[PDB]
C-alpha cells in the first residue's frame, strides 16, 4: 500500500546555444559585386557596387 | 529530543530525520520533500564553448 509519483518533462539541452540547425525561408534579394577599374594612364581603383 | 516510545519491538516502528541546514540537487533517485521546495540555483561549471581543434 504505497504510491510513487515519478513525473518527467522534456526541455532544451544546454548545448543548444552553440550548435543548432537554423531553419530559414529564402526569397529573392539584392546582388552586389566588386570591380577593378583602370583607364588610360591611371592606376587600378576598386569599389563595391 | 528523547521521547522514549512506550512500545515493544524495533521492527514495528519507522524513523526519519529532518535536516534542513543544507540543500541537495533534485535527483530522480531521491524522494521529494514535504511542500514548497524552493528553486534556488547553482551554476554549472564547465559549459560548452566553441574552440579550435
CA distance B29 to B33: 13
541537495: which residue's cell? B24
Instruction: In whole angstroms, give the CA distance from residue B22 to residue B17.
Output: 13
A45 - beta bridge partners?
A37
Q: How was this structure determined?
A: cryo-EM
Taking CB atoms and an 8 Å cut-off, how many pairs form between chains A and B? Answer: 10
In a 13 Å sphere around the CA of B42, the CA atoms on its Cβ side amount to: 7
Residue A9's Cβ-count burial label (10 Å; 0-12, 13-18, 19+) is exposed
User: Residues A44, A38: contact at Cβ < 8 Å?
Assistant: yes
Nearest CB partner across the interface for A14, out of B28, B32, B47? B47
Does the distance separating the beta carbons of B49 and A18 come in below 8 Å?
Answer: yes
Residue A15 sits at the chain B interface (C-beta within 8 Å): yes
The data reach a resolution, in angstroms, of 3.4
Burial B13-42 (b: 16+ CB within 10 A, else e): eeeeeeeeeeeeeeeeeeeeeeeeeeeeee
CA atoms in the 13 A half-sphere facing the CB of B5: 8
Hey, is A46 helix, strand or coil?
strand
- Determine the straight-line distance between the first and last CA of chain B, rounded to whole angstroms: 61
Residue A15 with chain B: CB contacts under 8 Å: 48
Amino acid at each position: 500500500e504505497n504510491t510513487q509519483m515519478s513525473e518527467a518533462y522534456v526541455e532544451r539541452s544546454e548545448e543548444c546555444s552553440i550548435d543548432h540547425a537554423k531553419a530559414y525561408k529564402v526569397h529573392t534579394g539584392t546582388v552586389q559585386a566588386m570591380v577593378n577599374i583602370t583607364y588610360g594612364s591611371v592606376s587600378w581603383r576598386s569599389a563595391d557596387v | 529530543s528523547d521521547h522514549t516510545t512506550t512500545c515493544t519491538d524495533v521492527k514495528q516502528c519507522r524513523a526519519y530525520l529532518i535536516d534542513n541546514k543544507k540543500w541537495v540537487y533534485n535527483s530522480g533517485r531521491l524522494p521529494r520533500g514535504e511542500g514548497d521546495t524552493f528553486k534556488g540555483k547553482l551554476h554549472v561549471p564547465f559549459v560548452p564553448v566553441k574552440a579550435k581543434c
